[PDB]
Chain A
């Protein structure tokens, strides 16, 4: 996990186009018609982790190996969802514990453009200031979504710095990043916020919420995976 066959090249609002297939765990969550409503991350061949607020159902589909959503010829994997596991602790009012697991009907066929992201340990400590990356097909301007997958490097923020803006809205299962010239935006939800752990890209956050106008000077708020990974491991083990 965490090692793309195709290495990404790094120099979402104010982000940049990603090298095709360089973020193999990135999936697009779409309805039966092919409408993209959220992103997600493959954690293995049978499971996808996304946000609870995305409201995924078994009627939706997981699209893996995609780069250009405007390309009808591009080879991809449309994977059916067998069961949706929304964290029962998801707070629809505070948005805390914003995570959901998707168990695929048929496993995804891993390849050069389709593989898994690594999951952190509950005790992992990713320091504030660490340069991480987020990806997705969300709006690049606060408008329709970009056809090609976007990426952006951004720093993790300390809870103290984040609270300087969001105050008490920041809960324990949330981690902030950004306010650095880039911003996750409508359509990026459920997607990954990854940081390197011993050289491997590890899921530190899940795009969740933030500025209502996707302001690049405002902290983006992500579901803190270290605070939710135990729930993830428990769910996989039991299913």
Chain B
């Protein structure tokens, strides 16, 4: 799996409160986090399914 899957979630500098998903390698599943709305990193998905399909097992 891509190494970006191992990066902690990144809220970013914008001030929004948008629900996104990130893969948590420690737990083995995708978790929700608050995204600021801009400059998202790759471990940032709009759905848990997209996240699991891209990072599952990392």
Contacts and interface: CB of A to CB of B under 8 A. Distances in A.
B15 A208 contact: yes
Given A92-B38, A209-B36, A209-B38, A186 B13 contact: no
B58 interface: no
A79 interface: no
Query: Which bracket fits the contact residues of B?
Result: 10 to 19
B11 A53 contact: no
- Chain A's interface: helix, strand, loop or mixed, by majority? loop
B37 A138 contact: no
A152 interface: no
Q: How large is the interface on A (under 10, 10 to 19, 20 to 34, 35 or more residues)?
A: 20 to 34
B17 A55 contact: no
A185 B39 CA distance: 16
A145 B11 CA distance: 16
Interface string B1-38: 00000000001111111110000000000000010111
A37 B12 contact: no
Main secondary structure of the interface of B (DSSP, over half): loop
A189 interface: yes
A216 B17 CA distance: 19
A35 B38 contact: no
A81 to B, nearest CB: 16
Interface centre among B15, B17, B36 (most CB of A within 10 A): B15
Given A55-B37, A92-B38, A188 B18 contact: no
Contact of A186 (B11, B38, B39): B11
B51 to A, nearest CB: 18
A238 B50 CA distance: 38
A207 interface: yes
Interface string B29-57: 00000101111000000000000000000
18 contacts: A35-B19, A36-B17, A37-B16, A37-B19, A38-B16, A53-B36, A54-B16, A55-B18, A55-B37, A95-B39, A184-B15, A185-B15, A186-B17, A189-B17, A189-B36, A190-B16, A209-B13, A210-B13
Q: Which 10 A-B pairs have the closest CB atoms?
A: A53-B37, A189-B15, A187-B17, A189-B16, A209-B13, A53-B38, A209-B14, A53-B14, A37-B17, A188-B15
Given A53-B16, A54-B18, A55-B37, 16 more contacts: A37-B19, A38-B16, A38-B17, A53-B37, A55-B18, A92-B38, A93-B39, A95-B14, A138-B17, A185-B15, A186-B11, A207-B15, A210-B13, A212-B11, A212-B12, A212-B13
Interface of B: 11-19, 34, 36-39
